[PDB]
Write a protein that binds this ligand. Structure first.
Ligand SMILES: Cc1cn([C@H]2C[C@H](O)[C@@H](COP(=O)(O)OP(=O)(O)O[C@H]3O[C@H](C)[C@H](O)[C@H](NC=O)[C@H]3O)O2)c(=O)[nH]c1=O
Ligand SMILES: Cc1cn([C@H]2C[C@H](O)[C@@H](COP(=O)(O)OP(=O)(O)O[C@H]3O[C@H](C)[C@H](O)[C@H](NC=O)[C@H]3O)O2)c(=O)[nH]c1=O
Ligand SMILES: Nc1nc(=O)c2c([nH]1)NC[C@@H](CNc1ccc(C(=O)N[C@@H](CCC(=O)O)C(=O)O)cc1)N2C=O
Ligand SMILES: Nc1nc(=O)c2c([nH]1)NC[C@@H](CNc1ccc(C(=O)N[C@@H](CCC(=O)O)C(=O)O)cc1)N2C=O
Ligand SMILES: [Cl-]
Lengths: 274, 273
């Protein structure tokens, strides 16, 4: 049966680089379809455009409706924006790479939520798609550090890097259908929705230096927003082990020096610094 | 030097039982003074009164002002309610047992905050008192599990048990001034104040079963409050690994059946009243 073997649905460098990899190594253009996200305008910007790549390489753009009845298609979500209902699909080869160490941080804004909840590590997880949000059985996972001064943007670029890597690592077993999976546990499972995160974050300074630093850097992702302290945008936060006294807060031309209830030095750099 | 060797400041069975231990094993009444918390009624309630125990055993009740100038006094806070300033004291022998696994969960409501933040363990920590809140150097720590269906009350009674034990384990080295300590790390340090916690918790059901369960059980401490769902108080939450479908919520006479976005079964048992 069908001409079409695989759909890449989603966006950004992970979708494009994964598509490029399958086109290189596994499938021809006329065996592939893509479903870009709704906001993809076909322009390479701070991320590559999946729509652009498809148009440039002669790969058909489709809707979900067009692929539901396609027997045995591999459906791969790589930052895809639409919740699927699995019973729509004839095929049960439905996979996602989620940007967290599941079962933690299901849902959205995963470059923000682990930092804001004081994690020292995150991960990428390849899993089956079921009808819930990031709830399906885990196939592989790679965990990696959130370095102490990483911003949400830095973490997102690590997700793209390690996510592309885990795709390449696992795709052969998906294609031959010999992969193994395990149910997610109930314990440690967590979830955040768009509503749970106010993107204009008001910092609670009656917190430890680690928590104040995490509140700042979790919102540093300049293409979307920067945290504002005393009507200044912040581009970087640096947390030191140096004790400087409790509850320090001082504004300078290029930065703030801050400490919380445990007195460790934070330098919050203003965007205006040359 | 001074007749007075030690001050026990605080409340509840950890303070009473630790005081009893030192009276039995180390110091006579005249060597000990006590500073109860402001709210000590001088009667036993669901915990024993430190004030009553001191009075019954001929131990003087004092204020901070009366102990500042006592050379070499051991000041030991066991659930004490007043922030001290270390430069007030001649002595540098100032100690506390904090009900968390420091550096995590500095501050208050520590039977609530670890559960609410999805922890699987907590601890008790013996540390030196410095001028910040639970920030001084760590002398000893004992960590222990938060079992999956434990409530804030169950957690508190574990703090009392393990806190009393860590007192007994370390007190001789404290009296002999032979203990070792280590500064707290900056990383992992967290802190909650009274304003951070609304004790009338409104549950967010757009969460995992583990999160909805933790929101419920974090506020189960019947001496103070129980969480309310549709005008029923909840006395126990039970989380299973049985999948029952996503986003279940059904009310029955004696319990609710609930699941969150990942579909695992919670039974939230109503208080029998
Ligand atoms: C939209 C937006 C994003 N960001 C940051 C944080 C967020 O983690 C990162 C990527 O944003 P995004 O592409 O909208 O993805 P999220 O991390 O919210 O991931 C969710 O949406 C994407 C499109 C997928 O549907 C993804 N699917 C699940 O596996 C879902 O978790 O940019 C902001 O800082 N501010 C913003 O306003
Ligand atoms: C007052 C109150 C308490 N509780 C619970 C949670 C709290 O962790 C537990 C014990 O309450 P608490 O005796 O006021 O102590 P906290 O855990 O707030 O500890 C703080 O206060 C005590 C008096 C000490 O100052 C303690 N000092 C530091 O080591 C501080 O952390 O009862 C309620 O559920 N509801 C309430 O209304
Ligand atoms: N069934 C299914 N499960 C998945 O885990 C999944 C898919 N489909 N499709 C691709 C991607 C979709 N990821 C998402 C995640 C969240 C929202 C979302 O709209 N969240 C809303 C709440 C939605 C709701 O409550 O119904 C929000 O405001 O956060 C959309 C797509 N994904 C990958 O595996
Ligand atoms: N200097 C000092 N450090 C301590 O760690 C300490 C003491 N004193 N004294 C005994 C106990 C006192 N613990 C506490 C903890 C918090 C509050 C309190 O009122 N917290 C307020 C915030 C106060 C503030 O911001 O200054 C709140 O609303 O949460 C009081 C006593 N304690 C044990 O080692
Ligand atoms: Cl110290």
């Amino acid at each position: 049966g069908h001409m079409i073997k695989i759909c890449i649905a989603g966006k950004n460098n992970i979708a494009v680089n994964s598509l490029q990899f399958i086109l290189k190594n596994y499938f021809e253009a006329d065996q592939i379809v893509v479903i870009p996200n709704k906001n993809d305008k076909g322009i390479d910007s701070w991320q590559k455009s999946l729509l652009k790549f498809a148009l440039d390489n002669n790969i058909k753009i489709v809707t979900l409706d067009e692929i539901y009845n396609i027997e045995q298609i591999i459906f791969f979500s790589l930052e895809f924006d639409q919740i699927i209902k699995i019973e729509n699909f004839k095929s049960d080869r439905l996979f996602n790479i989620h940007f967290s160490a599941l079962p933690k941080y299901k849902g959205v804004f995963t470059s923000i939520t682990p930092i804001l909840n004081n994690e020292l590590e995150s991960g990428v997880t390849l899993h089956r798609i079921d009808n819930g949000i990031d709830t399906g059985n885990i196939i592989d996972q790679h965990c990696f550090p959130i370095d102490i001064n990483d911003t949400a943007r830095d973490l997102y670029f690590n997700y793209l890097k390690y996510g592309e890597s885990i795709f390449k690592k696992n795709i052969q077993t998906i294609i031959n259908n010999s992969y193994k999976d395990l149910k997610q546990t109930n314990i440690n499972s967590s979830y955040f929705s768009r509503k749970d995160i106010n993107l204009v974050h008001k910092i609670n300074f009656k917190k430890t230096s680690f928590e104040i630093h995490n509140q700042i850097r979790a919102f540093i992702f300049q293409e979307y927003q920067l945290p504002i302290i005393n009507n200044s945008k912040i581009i970087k936060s640096i947390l030191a082990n140096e004790f400087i006294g409790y509850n320090v807060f001082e504004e300078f031309e290029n930065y703030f020096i801050i400490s919380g209830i445990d007195g460790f030095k934070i330098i919050a750099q203003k965007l205006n610094k040359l």
